[PDB]
């Protein structure tokens, strides 16, 4: 970062022998550094370092501190620096620092240099800017991406489940039926299964077959938002089914399946069509009880079993 | 208007602004007003006084204080006078540097 | 196992441009060579890979 | 088309559609439309009343008119 | 911020948005009829909420 | 304007230029700036050069560079300066051909 400023100012503190190290002294060492882009863009205001040396000096040892007005200004340019430009702060973020704060002498010395402020806030913005200047939105609202967390390296490690991946990966890779289910007691990985596929297709592990299909948890909390009204969840799953359809890339993880076998007359048809791809994670159980008695559910999905 | 008003938080402020500013060459009155612990510090210019000079010290006191949010009348009625016509010799001559 | 000449290629590109960064040229120019070099033996690679690029269904994968 | 699970029927639906395609049908069936329907499809987003029952008839009107 | 809200039941795919990922920390309440009958019957809440049971 | 800035993805990108380009006989100075690995061209005209012949090497360029997406104050400030005065020069005496 530009720290000569903050250098200069002690120095220009000295020269103009103050008792204190204001806005204006802040200013002056902006002008001191033609190279910045606050230099740069008050220049193209007509506002040099001479004018700005004798309107201070018109208007305005040792303990020399940062008046709490100074301080404020940094604080305020270190929360300018939130506009996605990380920790570094440059002379630009101090220059808009300034600009927000419109108290002090700097602010003074605007005024009395007649500089607009929404103007060289928008000068700096395009200073700052570009000169030269699908999507599923449902299914990513009610959904938990794990593609996008894997790619961003949040996602916590998945060990020692090579050969259920291995297994999933062979299931999804069928022609009819590749829609695999995971079989296992709560807690024992079902989830890390899923999030294990999601990190073989980022770190590039997974054929080239699903190379580049993205992982989305289709969480059962709320889809159903009301039980009572004729259509109102279907509406929903179907929207969400043919987005999915339109963007032949998502791969679907239902947790809990056998909650959904209501939505059953919905899924069959895209799933007997081929229009969605899904894994699911059930207890043995509840599998047991609720998609072996359904033949056409069977004809769909292929169970794999997850052991503690 | 030829009275201004500024907000000093803290003692400790008034402190500071007594000490380390030095305010523009100029003559003026200062009183101190207090209400529920908060400081408010008006100077009264004279019939010669620009509205620089009246700005650029609001600004001291914005780097040291902050802008009033009591009108006048409310002070001269609610809050009571601690210093009149002396503010920076009577601290500096009581309290000590930071 | 070809993955070991892609991390050998990033970490060549990665020293090129570190190195041309700091103006110092005539080591850019052996690093580019460098990386050319490694760029080919990587698509030597792949080729043979896809020159090795039939499996036949036999009735003991059925029976499996 | 009855029959156990997996035998063939909707197989059977579709080279009805195949047969059509190709054209070894009768005359009376040379250029219809196959067309799937689902009832779930049918019955989405019908909260209100009436809404289901004015569907389902302006399907069965469009099919009067088309004839094919 | 921590959020609170009172009767969660009263509330998983509304908030999944700050939940899914844990960017909301709830740290709502509820009786036990209304935590075992919707609560714990969800696997999202089970992955998040914690039960912390309040004595007499 | 008197500036044309470019911006060249990758070296190979450079190179290529500096020995297939073939500017208009024209005077002008050259530098090559380089943030976060893309590497941006600036070329400065004399006062006596035409406009129009600005343009036409502006176009010339864009054949192997893409237009800049930061501005040549943002250059000045955070790009640092790899080659003065003379970049393809300098680019043909020190990389060899392709
Ligand atoms: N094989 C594994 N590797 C790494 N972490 C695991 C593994 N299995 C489980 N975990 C961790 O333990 C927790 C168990 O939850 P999980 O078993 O995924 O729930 P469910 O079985 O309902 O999907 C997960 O949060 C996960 O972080
Ligand atoms: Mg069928």
């Known amino acids: 970062r530009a720290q000569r400023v903050l250098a200069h100012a002690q120095e220009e503190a000295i020269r103009l022998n103050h008792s204190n190290i204001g806005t204006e002294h802040l200013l002056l060492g902006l002008m001191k550094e033609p190279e910045g882009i606050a230099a740069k863009v008050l220049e193209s205001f007509n506002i040099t370092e001479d004018k700005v040396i004798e309107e201070v000096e018109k208007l305005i040892v040792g303990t020399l501190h940062y008046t709490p007005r100074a301080k404020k200004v940094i604080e305020l340019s270190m929360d300018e620096a939130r506009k996605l430009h990380h920790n570094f702060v440059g002379t630009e973020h101090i220059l808009l620092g300034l600009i927000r704060e419109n108290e002090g002498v700097a602010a003074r010395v605007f005024a009395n240099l007649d500089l607009n402020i929404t103007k060289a806030r928008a000068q700096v913005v395009k200073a700052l800017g570009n000169p030269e200047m699908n999507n599923t939105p449902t299914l990513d609202s009610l959904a938990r991406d794990l593609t996008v967390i894997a790619k961003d390296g949040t996602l916590d490690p998945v060990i020692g489940r090579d050969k259920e991946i291995t297994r999933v990966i062979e299931v999804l890779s069928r022609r009819t039926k590749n829609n695999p289910v995971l079989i296992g007691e709560p807690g024992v990985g079902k989830t890390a299964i899923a999030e294990g596929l999601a990190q073989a297709i980022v770190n590039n592990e997974v054929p080239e077959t699903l190379k580049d299909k993205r992982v989305m948890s289709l969480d059962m909390g709320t889809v159903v938002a009301g039980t009572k009204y004729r259509g109102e969840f279907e509406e929903r799953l179907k929207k969400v089914m043919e987005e999915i359809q339109q963007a032949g890339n998502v791969i679907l993880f239902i947790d809990e399946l056998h909650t959904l076998v209501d939505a059953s007359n919905i899924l069959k048809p895209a799933l007997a069509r081929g229009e969605l791809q899904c894994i699911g994670a059930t207890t043995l159980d509840e599998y047991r009880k609720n998609i072996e008695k359904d033949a056409a559910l069977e004809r769909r999905f292929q169970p794999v079993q997850v052991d503690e | 208007t030829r009275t201004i008003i500024v907000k000093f938080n803290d003692l400790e402020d008034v402190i500071n602004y007594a000490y380390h500013s030095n305010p523009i060459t100029t003559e003026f009155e200062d009183l101190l007003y207090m209400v529920d612990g908060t400081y408010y510090y008006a100077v009264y210019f004279d019939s010669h006084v620009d509205q620089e000079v009246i700005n650029d010290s609001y600004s001291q006191l914005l780097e040291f204080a902050y802008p009033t949010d009591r009108t006048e009348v409310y002070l001269n009625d609610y809050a009571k006078i601690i210093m009149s016509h002396n503010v920076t010799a009577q601290v500096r001559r009581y309290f000590p540097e930071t | ?64």
């Open chain 3, 1 to 64: 196992n070809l993955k070991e000449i892609e991390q050998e290629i990033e970490k060549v590109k990665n020293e090129k441009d570190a190195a041309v960064h700091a103006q110092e040229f005539e080591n850019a120019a052996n690093l580019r060579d460098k990386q050319t070099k490694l760029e080919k033996q990587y698509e030597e690679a792949k080729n043979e890979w896809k020159n090795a690029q039939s499996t036949s269904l036999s009735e003991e994968d059925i029976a499996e």
